[PDB]
Symmetry: C2
Subunit: 168 residues, 2 copies
């Protein structure tokens, strides 16, 4: 079956980490939506632009089948938005497929869903993932039930290779 996949991001996203899964997932015939603080566009660390489909306030988590959490600087401000964190917690706790890369897990940390879980992130926040109760693993991709996690843009091939398997 086809899915509606939600992406949470903001200005300062790591360009490849948002744009790669958008296209890769759309290739499969899934529908992709980007939520952020405001309608309009968001701009990456490296200058690429992405259109925003809806705001965090507008999101009904029950309307979406899967969640993607790219990295960059964006997770540090996205994790301060209580709605974005509530969306994340709801979707993750409902056991919907959730994909994260790089700093994306800072949103998962804030969502208080990582205790007893296993995955990865940029190693620069390894200690924070551990402090959130998860086992941190240094690997290109980790699959922990619904949670598919990778570290950085070198891992993109493996990240979506594993994530697309959950999107049916």
């Amino acid at each position: 079956a086809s899915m509606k996949v939600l992406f949470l991001s903001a200005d300062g996203f790591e360009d490849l980490e948002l744009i790669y899964p958008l296209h890769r997932i759309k290739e499969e015939g899934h529908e992709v939506y980007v939520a952020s603080f405001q309608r309009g566009k968001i701009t990456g660390k490296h200058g690429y632009s992405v259109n925003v489909d809806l705001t965090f306030e507008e999101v009904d988590p029950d309307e979406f089948d899967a969640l993607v959490l790219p990295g960059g600087k964006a997770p540090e401000i996205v994790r301060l938005n209580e709605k974005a964190v509530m969306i994340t917690r709801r979707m993750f706790e409902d056991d919907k497929p959730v994909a994260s890369i790089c700093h994306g897990p800072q949103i998962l940390i804030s969502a208080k869903v990582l205790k007893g879980r296993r995955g990865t992130s940029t190693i620069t926040i390894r200690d924070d993932v551990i402090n959130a109760g998860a086992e941190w693993i240094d690997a290109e991709v980790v699959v922990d039930g619904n949670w598919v996690s990778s570290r950085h843009p070198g891992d993109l091939y493996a990240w979506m290779r594993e994530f697309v398997k959950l999107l049916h």
Copy 2:
């Protein structure tokens, strides 16, 4: 499992090189970045990729498919006789060749486009037409072995069709 060669240089459009590298590797194919020299090459937006081999080191007979990303790189790549030879040989041998944006400037220089059909960035439409091809404004065009797209907005469709050609 095929060996897929990418021709690029400094000034490449970052997504147009990096998206297909990962997308194709996902499939279990082996990917190779060739440029003027060993070391690294850096995109328009500052992403870096390692160079696996030089143009002069490439035997086109050892590669199964070819990818030609865009940006500023094609305009200097098309000046390299060997890079142009690699592309002419692989294309005439009917191996899968994917191009996007300015990548077809290399195909123009390889003199392989007469009576062919495809796309590119619209800013070089007239040059593709002058090379003997029919130019189509579409997110992806498939003309036998030649899969062509225009710009980063077309990436999903571009590799969707190209991966099919690879299997």
